C-alpha cells in the first residue's frame, strides 16, 4: 500500500502550505474526515496524479516511485473523483466495459474477452434485472451504483473515492459503505474514502485520518477517534460521544 512523505500543498490555491506525513494500512478502510477546504480533497487528488506535487513525492507499492504507466496505475487504483462528474453517459451496462479498459486495452481486446468479470461486477454491486435497459438521467441511488460498477469491474488493488456519501440518502450510503466493506473483506482491498459524516464513516471504517487547517490531526482507530477532544479539534463545534445501543461505533451528537 502506498504511503506519502510529501510536504507540498495547494500553494497557489487559497495560499496554503503544510507538511504531510501518513502511512496507509495494508488492507483496511481509511476514512478521510475534516473540513471541506481542510486538504483531504487535495490529498486524494495528489494521490490520483491529478496534479504533480511541488515538494516531496508519494511512494507506492514500496518498490517504485511516482512515475508509473497509466495502464499499470489504473490496474491497481480506481478513482472516484465526484467533482467534475461523468454527465450524460448515454449508455447503461457499457460503463463496466469502459472500466475494463486497462485490462483488455485498445488492441487485442477481443471485444472484452472473458465476460464473466463484467457480469460478476454488475451482480455483486447490486442484484439488478434491468441491465441494458436504463437511461443516463436517473436518480443518484442508481447513478452511484453504476459509477462503482466499473470500479469493481476494474478489480484494481486500491479504491480511492472522495465523497461517495454526497448527494445520497442514508439508505444509499449504507448500501455503498456495506458494498465497500464487503469488497475489502473478500478481496482484501485497500480503500480510502472521503466522508463528511463522522459517525457514518466510522461505522464502516477502521483507520480514519482527520485533516484540519493544513496538516493532519489524528490517525487512530474509530474507538480512539470518537473522543470529544478530537471532534472538537477537527470540526470546531463542541460535540459529545455516547455508546451506541446496537451499533459497533458509538454515536456522536452535536451540541
Amino acid at each position: 500500500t502506498f504511503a506519502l512523505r510529501n510536504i507540498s500543498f495547494r500553494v497557489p490555491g487559497r495560499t496554503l502550505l503544510h507538511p504531510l506525513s501518513l502511512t496507509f494500512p495494508a488492507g483496511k478502510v481509511t476514512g478521510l474526515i475534516g473540513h471541506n477546504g481542510s486538504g483531504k480533497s487535495t490529498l486524494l487528488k495528489m494521490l490520483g496524479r491529478h496534479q504533480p506535487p511541488s515538494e516531496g513525492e508519494i511512494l507506492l507499492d514500496a518498490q517504485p516511485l511516482e512515475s508509473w504507466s497509466s495502464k499499470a496505475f489504473a490496474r491497481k487504483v480506481a478513482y472516484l473523483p465526484q467533482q467534475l462528474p461523468p454527465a450524460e453517459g448515454m449508455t447503461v451496462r457499457e460503463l463496466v466495459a469502459i472500466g475494463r479498459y486497462p485490462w483488455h486495452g485498445a488492441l487485442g481486446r477481443f471485444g472484452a474477452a472473458d465476460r464473466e468479470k463484467v457480469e460478476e461486477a454488475i451482480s455483486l454491486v447490486g442484484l439488478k434485472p434491468l441491465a441494458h435497459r436504463l437511461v443516463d438521467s436517473l436518480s443518484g441511488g442508481e447513478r452511484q451504483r453504476a459509477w462503482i460498477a466499473m470500479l469493481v469491474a476494474q478489480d484494481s488493488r486500491c479504491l480511492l473515492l472522495d465523497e461517495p456519501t454526497s448527494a445520497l440518502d442514508i439508505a444509499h450510503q449504507v448500501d455503498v459503505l456495506s458494498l465497500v466493506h464487503r469488497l475489502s473483506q473478500e478481496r482484501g482491498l485497500t480503500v480510502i474514502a472521503v466522508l463528511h459524516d463522522i459517525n457514518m464513516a466510522a461505522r464502516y471504517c477502521d483507520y480514519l485520518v482527520a485533516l484540519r487547517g493544513g496538516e493532519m490531526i489524528a490517525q487512530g482507530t474509530p474507538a480512539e477517534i470518537m473522543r470529544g477532544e478530537t471532534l472538537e479539534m477537527i470540526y470546531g463545534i463542541p460535540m459529545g460521544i455516547l455508546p451506541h445501543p446496537a451499533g459497533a461505533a458509538p454515536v456522536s451528537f452535536v451540541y
Binding site: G48, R49, H50, S70, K71, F73, A74, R75, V77, A78, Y79, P81, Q83, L84, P85, P86, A87, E88, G89, M90, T91, E94, I98, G99, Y101, P102, A106, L107, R109, M150
Partner: protein, 630 residues
C-alpha cells in the same frame, strides 16, 4: 498591474507620436489651429483635406468605443468570456444587404437595415420554436446565429460568383478602410452612439444579472427572456451602425474587454469605460499605422491589418442498424439517380449516354461523397473530443490554413500561380497548412484555447481573402470557387487515391472507439480509467487533421457539412460512438451528393460549387430541427 498600465502608456505615447508625425507631414503645424477649428477652412489644398483627415480620427475613436461596448455586451448576454459579433450574423447580414442594394438599384443605409432584419428574424425564430413560451437559451441562440451567418454568407457567395465585377465597392466595405471624405459619417454616428451609450447607462442591473447565472437572474425577478431579447437587439443595432459606418473590422471589441479586465476595473461601468477607451486606442494605433503605410508603401485596409496584428497578440496572451441500412440504401439509390438523371431537358441516361457522361459525373459525385463522409467523421470526432457544440473542422485551422497558403501564394508572386512551375501552388498550400496546424497545436494546450486560436486564424484567413478580393485581381474569382468547395477539378486517379485514404482512415477509426467513448464524460475520470489524456488527444487531433486535409485536397476548404452532420445525427436520436459516427457520415455523404447534384443540375449552364448548395439545403432543415426541439 504594472505591465498593463505600462503597455497602455506606451500605446498612448506611440499613438500621439504617430498622429503628430502624420499631421505634420500632411500640414505644417503653424496652420493647424486655422484648419481644425475653422468650419470654413481655407481653399488651400494642403489645408482642405483636413476636412477628411480629422473625421478619420473621430470615426476611429467612436468605432473603437462602440466595438468595446458591443464586445462587453456580447460577453455579458451570452455569458461567454469571448465576444463574437460576426458569428451572430450581424456582419454577414450587413454584407448581404450591401450586395443586394448594390444591384437592382434601391440604395440607402443597407448594412444597418439588413443586419437589424437578420437579428429580428433570428429573434423571431428563437422565440417561436415549438411552444408559446420563448424558452431561449444561449447555446441554441449561438447555434442559430452561426446557421444564419453561414446562410447569408452562402447567399453572398452566390451573388458574387454570379456578379463579382460589379461588387468591388462592397469588397472595400468588407475590409473596413474607414477612409472618410467628409463629416457626414461622424455627424450620423455620434448621435446614434450617444443614444447607444445612454441606453447602456440605463438597464445596468439587468446586464449584471445577465452576467451571472440564469437561475439567480430569474430568482431576482428579472424577465430574463425580455431583458435578454432587448439587450441582444441593442447589441445588434449598435453593431449594425458600426459596420454601416466602417464595415468589417479586425475584432478590436475582442481585445478591448479582455485588456480592460486585465488592467482592473471590478465594477461594471468602469470596465465599460476602460474597454471603450482601449478599443479607441487600438483603432487609433491601427489607423495611424495604415496612414504611415499608405504614405510610404501601398494602400492597405485597416481591419485586415488589425486582425493580422491581433492574431499573434492573441496567440501570445493565450433501431440504429436499421436506420443506418435505410440511409445507406437511400444514398445508393440517390447516387443511381444522380448518375442517370440530367438537366439538358431532364433526360435520363438509358445506357449509351451513360458512359459518355460518366467521366464528368462519376469522379465528381464520388469525390463529393468521400469529402462529405470524411468531413462528417472529422466533425463528429472533434465534437466528441472537445464537447462543444460549436466545434467545426475549421477549429483545427486546416481549411483556413490551406486557404491562407493559397492567398499568400497569390499575393507573393504574380501570374498563373495555380499551375506555374515556379509557383508552389499545392505544395505551398500544404506547407502553410502544416505550419498553421503546428502553430495551433503549440499555441493552445487546452481544446478551448485551441478553439480560440482556430477562430482567430479563420478570421485572419477571411481578412486576407477580402484583401485579395478588394484589389482588382483577375484571379480572385478562380480561387473563390476553390474556397466555395467545388467538385470541378476531380479526377479518376485522385478519386481512387482519396478512396484508399478514406478506407484506411475508416479502418483506423474503430480502434479509437474506446477513446471516443471514454473522452466523453471524462476529464479526471478518463485519466483514472487507464488512458493517457494528451497522448491520445493529440492523436485524435492528428486524425481529424488528416481527415480535413484530404477533404480540402478533394473538395476544398469547406466545413458546413462537417459542422451540421454531427448536429443532425445527434438530434435524430443517436448518441453512441460508432452509431453516431456512421449516421453522421452517411448523412453528410448524402447531403453533399444532393448539394453537388443541385449545383450541377438545378441550373444547367451555370455550375454553382457544392459548398454553397450544402448550406442552402442544410440551413432550412437545421432551423426546422432547432425549432422542433427548442
Amino acid at each position: 498591474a504594472l505591465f498593463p498600465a505600462l503597455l497602455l502608456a506606451l500605446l498612448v505615447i506611440v499613438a500621439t507620436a504617430l498622429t503628430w508625425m502624420n499631421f505634420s507631414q500632411a500640414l505644417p503645424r503653424s496652420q493647424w489651429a486655422q484648419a481644425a477649428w475653422s468650419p470654413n477652412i481655407n481653399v488651400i489644398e494642403q489645408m482642405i483635406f483636413h476636412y477628411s483627415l480629422l473625421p478619420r480620427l473621430a470615426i476611429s475613436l467612436l468605432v473603437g468605443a462602440g466595438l468595446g461596448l458591443v464586445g462587453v455586451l456580447f460577453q455579458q448576454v451570452l455569458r461567454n468570456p469571448l465576444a463574437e459579433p460576426t458569428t451572430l450574423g450581424v456582419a454577414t447580414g450587413a454584407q448581404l444587404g450591401i450586395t443586394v442594394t448594390t444591384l437592382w438599384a434601391i440604395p440607402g443605409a443597407m448594412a444597418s437595415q439588413f443586419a437589424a432584419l437578420a437579428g429580428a428574424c433570428v429573434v423571431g425564430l428563437i422565440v417561436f420554436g415549438v411552444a408559446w413560451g420563448k424558452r431561449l437559451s444561449p447555446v441554441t441562440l449561438i447555434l442559430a446565429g452561426l446557421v444564419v451567418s453561414l446562410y447569408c454568407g452562402a447567399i453572398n457567395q452566390l451573388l458574387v460568383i454570379f456578379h463579382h465585377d460589379q461588387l468591388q465597392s462592397m469588397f472595400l466595405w468588407s475590409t473596413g478602410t474607414l477612409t472618410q471624405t467628409d463629416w457626414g459619417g461622424v455627424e450620423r454616428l455620434w448621435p446614434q452612439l450617444l443614444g447607444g451609450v445612454m441606453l447602456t447607462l440605463l438597464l445596468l442591473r439587468p446586464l449584471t444579472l445577465m452576467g451571472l447565472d440564469d437561475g439567480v437572474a430569474r430568482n431576482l425577478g428579472l424577465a430574463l427572456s425580455l431583458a435578454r431579447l432587448a439587450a441582444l437587439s441593442l447589441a445588434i443595432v449598435i453593431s449594425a451602425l458600426l459596420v454601416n459606418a466602417v464595415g468589417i473590422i479586425g475584432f478590436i471589441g475582442l481585445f478591448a474587454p479582455l485588456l480592460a479586465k486585465m488592467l482592473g476595473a471590478r465594477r461594471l461601468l468602469p470596465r465599460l469605460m476602460l474597454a471603450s477607451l482601449i478599443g479607441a486606442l487600438i483603432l487609433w494605433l491601427s489607423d495611424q499605422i495604415i496612414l504611415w503605410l499608405t504614405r510610404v508603401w501601398m494602400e492597405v485596409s485597416t481591419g485586415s491589418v488589425t486582425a493580422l496584428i491581433g492574431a499573434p497578440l492573441l496567440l501570445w496572451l493565450l433501431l440504429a442498424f436499421a436506420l443506418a441500412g435505410g440511409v445507406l440504401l437511400l444514398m445508393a439509390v440517390v447516387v443511381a439517380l444522380s448518375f442517370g438523371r440530367d438537366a439538358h431537358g431532364w433526360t435520363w441516361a438509358s445506357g449509351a449516354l451513360l458512359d459518355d457522361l460518366m467521366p464528368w459525373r462519376w469522379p465528381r459525385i464520388m469525390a463529393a461523397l468521400f469529402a462529405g463522409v470524411m468531413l462528417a467523421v472529422a466533425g463528429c470526432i472533434i465534437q466528441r473530443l472537445t464537447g462543444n457544440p460549436m466545434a467545426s473542422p475549421e477549429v483545427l485551422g486546416i481549411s483556413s490554413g490551406a486557404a491562407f497558403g493559397v492567398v499568400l501564394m497569390l499575393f507573393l508572386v504574380p501570374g498563373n500561380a495555380f499551375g506555374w512551375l515556379l509557383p508552389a501552388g499545392s505544395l505551398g498550400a500544404a506547407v502553410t497548412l502544416l505550419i498553421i496546424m503546428i502553430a495551433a497545436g503549440r499555441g493552445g494546450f487546452s481544446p478551448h484555447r485551441m478553439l480560440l486560436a482556430g477562430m482567430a486564424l479563420s478570421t485572419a484567413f477571411t481578412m486576407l481573402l477580402m484583401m485579395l478580393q478588394a484589389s482588382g485581381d483577375p484571379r480572385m474569382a478562380q480561387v473563390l470557387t476553390w474556397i466555395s468547395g467545388s467538385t470541378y477539378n476531380a479526377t479518376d486517379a485522385q478519386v481512387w487515391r482519396t478512396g484508399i485514404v478514406m478506407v484506411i482512415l475508416l479502418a483506423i477509426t474503430p480502434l479509437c472507439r474506446r477513446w471516443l467513448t471514454i473522452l466523453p464524460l471524462g476529464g479526471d475520470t478518463a485519466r483514472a480509467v487507464g488512458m493517457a489524456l494528451t497522448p491520445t488527444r493529440i492523436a485524435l487531433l492528428l486524425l481529424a487533421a488528416c481527415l480535413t486535409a484530404t477533404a480540402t485536397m478533394t473538395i476544398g476548404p469547406l466545413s458546413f457539412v462537417g459542422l451540421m452532420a454531427p448536429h443532425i445525427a445527434r438530434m435524430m436520436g443517436f448518441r453512441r460512438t460508432m452509431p453516431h459516427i456512421v449516421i453522421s457520415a452517411l448523412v453528410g455523404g448524402l447531403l453533399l451528393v444532393f448539394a453537388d447534384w443541385c449545383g450541377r443540375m438545378v441550373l444547367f449552364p451555370f455550375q454553382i460549387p457544392a459548398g454553397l448548395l450544402s448550406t442552402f439545403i442544410g440551413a432550412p432543415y437545421f432551423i426546422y430541427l432547432l425549432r422542433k426541439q427548442s
